[model samples]
Target: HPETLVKVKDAEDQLGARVGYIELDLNSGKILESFRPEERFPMVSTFKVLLCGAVLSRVDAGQEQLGRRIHYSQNDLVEYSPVTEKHLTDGMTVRELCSAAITMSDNTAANLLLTTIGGPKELTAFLHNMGDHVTRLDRWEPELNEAIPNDERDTTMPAAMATTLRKLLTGELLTLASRQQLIDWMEADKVAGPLLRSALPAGWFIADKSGAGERGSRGIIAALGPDGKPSRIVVIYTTGSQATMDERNRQIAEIGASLIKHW
Candidate 1:
């Protein structure tokens, strides 16, 4: 095992859960370090990456326009979204909705994006074409109102999700414009400041998305060196954690610090 895995194992011990992590040297297509890289875990909102892909495919094919506007009423509101709190009477554009979905992880905006793209089937078809056959989405956010068993929720392997992220950034799976749009939204993520970003060097550009569950949080961050090339990719997915939020944050920060120190 590499030294990074030793540090990750130590951090996982403190985290009170079995952690699955993958660190990649994107410039060389090397798997620097990982534990259970192929293991599937509940994907929570990280599924939005594929959701963005679904919407962007249409946009790139000229079937959909980013400037197109979408209106929402009280009936569209859902828990855990600032979009509802803002209550814009004029609604928002497709670009704005994508931003809300990726940056804020807005539930209602996600459903709207799904509806606009036809449905969850559209996203699955997109992922299927990308050679990701297991990341399944069965229902919308409104349908997930009740807590379902983990086996029943949407899930994906850490390595697979990392591949999708790489393709998104490299323009292999999406148009360059759509790829940058997704990256821009992920770069603007406001929810993960204290999670994965807590230990990075100042001003290092990171494009990423995060997902949280009752038991744990998971996220993938792609870091760019000052020269703008891919430097390091960090992916941490946790499940069945008994630790408190503070403990989880502390563990994640330590893990990130170790990766940075050795990178």
Candidate 2:
């Protein structure tokens, strides 16, 4: 176990933060490398992918239709909701809302999708069935992005998040169509891709979602591998860093660069 947790010399020191990360084999479920993998960090917008997962499950079960349109007033908009706020007039399909939540980290879209799947408690229960008890969503954004140190609300552990992502993305937790839909949506992320995706080696495949919040907390949960498929999943987080957001993101990219070396 200690071997899985080889320390990154000066990683935490450089950022003035507590760092936690986990890398796992997507197929074998093996912990290839880690550091404080069980420590919790705020989910921030990173939870949007899971929120989309909740919707995809409903679609798979015939309980919901992605093509269904839901109209919202301008009053429903929230901070960071560029996609949903813009669509207030034309409205958007459930699939569009899910995509907006994951790819754009659209806050209004996420809140609506959260409600579509029956709120934070429902998403928590959905993960619970997969034994992912350590991941919790207790509030709506931008309130959920607070990232308060020592607070467990809206937080998840690195290892738990990686495992849960695998279950939904690669396992039988979702139908093939639904899984691919979720994957594609994550792959489309605009807000938080460059930090880690740009760090990948040439020929490597990467799709991800990243988050930043109070206390200098930042995180990303990504699917990574060779050209044809994802063979690994990684979750990385930092808390209490005084570093600027740009520096914090670059730190994650640096850690991601080390992962290929781990590869």
Candidate 3:
């Protein structure tokens, strides 16, 4: 069993945010521990997990091709994109773009997948139909909360997020091929340095996606970072961290290191 505790007493005072955590054994539907696990926060770029899974499911069902080349068109540049400076080229396959979306949180990659796959509506329907009611992908933009009004943004709970992730890991959320593709994409994720990742052991092989904003919806995932034993998974989501990004980060790293060494 995995146990997660808020060592506020053990942590140096620095910020002002509430932290939520959840650790699961993907192999078994076991929740080792949870802190404010039911609280909902903007999925941020982490929402791309749904997009990745939705797109791959299409490939599994023969609705889409895995190696289909996609080009970044002018229309794709019409929205909020962090990769605007990258001058992304066309001809990248859906698989590759999916990887970038998760690994690097690439906006260009996300738009490519959104256009190539149906749209947010289609992706939402696909995941919801699979019994994922808690994960809501209302739009294509990951950080849409910043542009639009606060109420218009999408939100998700740690329990639902963990469930969706667990479903993908077990190949139960989509087809086998789709699950494998999602797993690979998650493994390649580049955006780290959050709570779950902070709390895990040094050498674990877990496939996960995470996001951290300056305000609300800041957290991490413990996909890997294990000891000499089996894999361990942790999902930590926070909205009101009581510290600066740097201090919170230091706290996370320190606490995470302790989690790995102790628990």
Candidate 4:
């Protein structure tokens, strides 16, 4: 089969972790390659992409505006909210909150946005409306990242997550500007730099949201393409085992390295 299939399997063995992944060619709706594509993994912060998509859908429906200011106090802050925690005095706009959550993976910003949309179950409801019964959110941050083995809460299938991401980025699910801004914020991601982005070769374009937590769990959802623009989607997730974070990242990087042949 594909070289990436070999590499992915190798990664699982090397890391003693479950590795589930997929690569899709956006132009042809083709699955470049996948392994356990239907398997579930803890979503971690990667859920922020669809979470923001729901917000954009609200904006499209006039239920919300990106410029709206949201005020929160120091008590609202969570464990990893560098950006929102710094802006406690002035607060932030909805657009800014989206940016902070997606680009920086700020937990407080995500919690605030999640509340604005009605909470974890509402995001689950949004995914259901989008016809994605496979991706579910059951808790807020930290708890959502529990990664307890065989626990289905707050998990997503690789194929379903990729398809939903494709719908948000390419389909008419959002107003044009909202879609553009979504990509912009994803392109500005500060988290992927040390992981997935480092795995990529020169001149390729990539925009993604990533997550990490218990049992060496790490995941990334990305729009990737050759040079000019991104036309393929890459999703890779891992959990269980005690692999070092650096080792897990290195293993996935090799997967990205071979994915170039798909084009």
lDDT of 1 by residue, 73-166 (tens): 8787777778644855878888888898889989888888889987877777778888887767777884532223356456677777776677
Window of ten residues with lowest summed lDDT in model 2:
1-10
Decide which is better by lDDT, 1 or 4. 4
Give candidate 4 misplaced runs (Cα > 4 Å): none
How many pairs of residues collide in model 1? Answer: 0
The superposed Cα distance between candidate 1 and the true structure at residue 214, in angstroms, equals 2.6
Q: How accurate locally is residue 119 in candidate 3, as Cα lDDT from 0 to 100?
A: 74
Task: Indicate whether candidate 1 or candidate 2 has the larger TM-score.
Answer: 2
- lDDT by residue (tens digit), candidate 3, 60-140: 788888788776666666344555435555457787777777887777677778877777777777768887776666775
Q: How accurate is candidate 4 locally (lDDT)?
A: 0.89
The candidate scoring highest on lDDT is 4
Clashing pairs in 2: none
Q: Which lDDT tens digits does candidate 4 get at residues 201-241?
A: 68988889989978778999999887759999989999896
lDDT, candidate 2, 1-263, per-residue tens: 34223434356877888888888899998988888878888888789888888888989889899999989987788888878878888999999998888888888988888888899999999999877989999999889988877999999998999999999899898999999998988877888755788778788777788888788988899998888578899898888988988878777877777777657
> How well does candidate 4 match the true structure in TM-score terms?
0.97
Model 3 residue 32 distance off true place after TM-score fit, in angstroms: 1.6
lDDT of 2: 0.85
